Amino acid sequence: SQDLENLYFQGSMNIFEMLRIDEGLRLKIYKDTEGYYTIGIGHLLTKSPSLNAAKSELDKAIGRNTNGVITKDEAEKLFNQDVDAAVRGILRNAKLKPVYDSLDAVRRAALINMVFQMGETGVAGFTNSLRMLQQKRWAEAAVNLAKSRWYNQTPNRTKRVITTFATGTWDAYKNLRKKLEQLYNRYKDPQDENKIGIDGIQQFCDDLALDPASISVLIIAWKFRAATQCEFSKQEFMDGMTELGCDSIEKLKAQIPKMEQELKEPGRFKDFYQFTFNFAKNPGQKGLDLEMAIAYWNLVLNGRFKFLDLWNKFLLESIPKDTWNLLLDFSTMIADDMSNYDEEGAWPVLIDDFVEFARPQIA
Ligand SMILES: *CCC(=O)Nc1ccccc1CN(C(=O)Nc1cccc(C(F)(F)F)c1)C1CCN([C@H](C)CCC)CC1
């Protein structure tokens, strides 16, 4: 019934694939801009603070125990229910039904895209552009839409949607996908089409004018939600560039300082910091190799952890996730003379020992 096989008669490009590019697709439960558990293409699961509650809602909707992770096809099924609801709303709207009824399937997808972005009232404000669309005055409709605040807010997305109205084709999405495929091919592993290998990661860094050991490279990995440091998949690359709204190295270069600025929010730095452990640790290995931990600590805690030099000296004379995570809490709370350290605070033994190690130096 919700089987995607029921849609095999349609085109392979569709509204799901359109919004995957324009809004983005997440296959793991995350919190939206508010606090709320969400998955797929913007599918709200619950307003409950409980992740188990979100997981329960998700399992009911998918029909299996997902533990908070779904496939792209499952995301499409969720999305199709959302689209059907949106379309019913459009058909209830006296300002939108006539133009929707008049449009071909591709242009309907562009209208639905608008409704997902700005809602019915937003789209219904475009009275003259909607009338031009209903009259099939495509070029005038496109000109008028480009004059709007919408165009200023999300120019890349808005241009693609307007092109879809102007042409009744998927050209804007085809062109973007090809542009990214051609860029990806500059970095892909000659021995594995779906990976960027050691030469490719080096080339990517070179093209960005970045040292592979710089914190900037780790920040990009974070934004690309890369799973692991010694692999870089096609899916990660494509999904990352798409999310960042970059179709070239020039554009990605321009985003990097904006990524760095994001880390000024303590919440975002904590996410980055915890990410780093997961990214750094060899898959399978139970904890993070001490030397690797030191290397990454020196990158991410320089200028945040007042005792980083002593921390190096201490460790030079395997790190579990809990210990890694808690060092940032320690760094943040500890006074410059360590006088506020609470040895009954259930810090890792490593940190208890460090505080003992470090007090000749503070004396
Ligand atoms: C793991 C094998 C390896 O070194 N591969 C490699 C080759 C060339 C350049 C970098 C790397 C691995 N690193 C890395 O960040 N990889 C990465 C994976 C996925 C996505 C990205 C992206 F998007 F480009 F940012 C990058 C780096 C790992 C760690 N080293 C040093 C030790 C860091 C100093 C703390 C740097 C290279």
CATH number at residue 37: 1.10.530.40
- Say yes or no: 17 and 135 in one domain: yes
Tell me whether residue 247 is in a domain.
no
| Closest residue CA from atom 37 of ligand 1 | 212
Token code pair at residue 25 = 């697709």
* Lookup: tokens for 206: 């070179």
C-beta pairs of 288-291 under 8 Å, 24+ apart in sequence:
288/318, 288/319, 288/320, 288/321, 288/324, 289/318, 289/319, 290/315, 290/318, 290/319
Residues 27, 145: one domain?
yes
Q: Could you tell me the CA-to-CA distances from 229 to 8, 73, 212 in Å, in that order?
A: 38, 27, 11
SS3 246: coil
Task: Answer yes or no: is the C-beta of 229 below 6 A from any ligand 1 atom.
Answer: yes
Distance 341 CA to ligand 1 centre (A): 35
φ/ψ of residue 193, rounded to 5:
-45, -30
In a shared domain, residues 15 and 152: yes
Q: What angle do CA 244, 222, 53 make, to 5 degrees?
A: 90
The length of the chain, given as a count of residues: 363
Amino acid at 200: G
Q: 293 CB under 6 A from ligand 1?
A: no
Positions marked catalytic: 23, 32
Q: Tell me how far apart the alpha carbons of residues 310 and 297 are, in angstroms, rounded to a whole number.
A: 12
Range of the domain at 336: 267-362
Residues 166 and 311 reside in one and the same domain: no
Distance in Å, CA 211 to ligand 1 centroid: 10
Domain boundary among 171, 201, 221: 171
Kindly give the distance from the C-alpha atom of residue 295 to the centroid of ligand 1, in angstroms, as a whole number: 12
The DSSP call for residue 64 is S
Residue 278's closest CA among 311, 229, 232?
229
What is the Cα–Cα distance from 187 to 6, expressed in whole angstroms? 37
Residue corresponding to tokens 């809990």? 322
CB contact at 8 A, 219 and 263: yes
Give dist(CA 136, CA 140) in Å, integer.
Answer: 9
Angle formed at CA 87 by CA 94 and CA 20, multiple of 5 degrees:
135
CA nearest to 26, candidates 34, 12, 35, 37: 37
Residue 297 Cβ contacting ligand 1 at under 6 Å: no
CB–CB of 208/222 below 8 Å? no
Query: What gap in Å lies between CA 10 and CA 358, rounded to an integer?
Result: 67
Query: Same structural domain for residues 163 and 279?
Result: no
Q: Which residues contact 161 (CB under 8 A, 6 or more apart)?
A: 22, 110, 113, 114, 172
Is 39 a member of any domain?
yes
Of 183, 201, 224, 232, the residue with max ligand 1 atoms within 8 A of its CB, to mutate for a pocket test, comes to 201
Q: Which of 153, 171, 189 is the last residue in one of the domains? A: 171
In a domain, 134, yes or no: yes
Q: What is the C-alpha to C-alpha distance for residues 85 and 244, in angstroms, rounded to an integer?
A: 28
Residue 342, burial from CB neighbour count under 10 angstroms (0-12, 13-18, 19+): exposed
Name the domain boundary from 140, 171, 202: 171
Which residue is listed with tokens 């165009």? Answer: 151
Helix axis angle for 72-92 and 15-22, nearest 10°, is: 100
Domain assignment of residue 103, yes or no: yes
Is residue 35 domain-resident? yes
- Residue 336 resides in a domain: yes
Question: Is 8 contained in some domain?
Answer: yes
Which of helix, strand or coil describes residue 23? coil
SS3 at position 187: helix
The DSSP secondary-structure symbol of 238 reads: H
Atom of ligand 1 nearest to the CA of 224: 23
Inside any domain, residue 259: no
CA 165 to each of CA 110, 131, 171, 225: distance values in angstroms, whole numbers, following the listed order: 7, 13, 11, 33
Q: Please indicate, yes or no, whether residues 167 and 273 belong to a single structural domain of this protein.
A: no
Partner residues linked to 43 by β-bridges: 39
CA–CA separation, 331 and 305 (whole Å) = 5
Rounded CA gap, 321 and 293, in Å? 11
Kind of pairing, strands 26-31 and 37-40?
antiparallel
DSSP-derived 3-state class of residue 75: helix
Helix axis angle, 15-22 to 171-187, nearest 10°: 60
CA atoms within 13 A on the CB side of 163: 15
Check if 222 has its Cβ closer than 6 Å to any atom of ligand 1: no
- Between CA 311 and CA 295 the distance in angstroms is 12
Element (H, E) at 280: helix 266-280
Residue 111: exposure state from Cβ atoms within 10 A (0-12, 13-18, ≥19): buried
Contact 190, 207 (CB under 8 A): no
Experimental method: X-ray
- Per the structure, the count of domains in the chain is 2
